[PDB]
């Protein structure tokens, strides 16, 4: 229910899957980047990769939904 066109770059679904929304956000410290789905974000650090944007270490991931 987003309403801001500048944000359209952030509002994209999971870029790896595009089968599900971007419900995988990566927290590093006090900020986090919304970049993939929850499943991909978990798999990403398992592969040894850090945040794809800022490469700051992934402390945790959260599962967002409207439920």
């Amino acid at each position: 229910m987003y309403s801001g066109e500048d944000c359209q770059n952030l509002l994209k679904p999971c870029s790896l899957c595009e089968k599900r929304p971007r419900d995988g956000n990566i927290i590093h410290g006090r900020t986090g980047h919304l970049v993939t789905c929850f499943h991909c974000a978990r798999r990403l650090k398992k592969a040894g990769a850090s945040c794809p944007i800022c490469k700051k270490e992934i402390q945790l991931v959260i599962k967002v939904f409207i439920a």
Binding site: N25, R30, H33, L34, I62, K63, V64, F65
Partner: protein, 34 residues
């Protein structure tokens, strides 16, 4: 210990999520400190 049962929601501000919790821009509600 500051967690809420529905902390797994996208919130726009602290008042956008139930319970005694705050909202981060990273779509996380709550403050697990204490």
């Amino acid at each position: 210990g500051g967690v809420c049962p529905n902390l797994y929601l996208l919130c726009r501000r602290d008042s956008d999520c139930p319970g005694a919790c705050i909202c981060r821009h990273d779509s996380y509600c709550g403050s697990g400190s204490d």
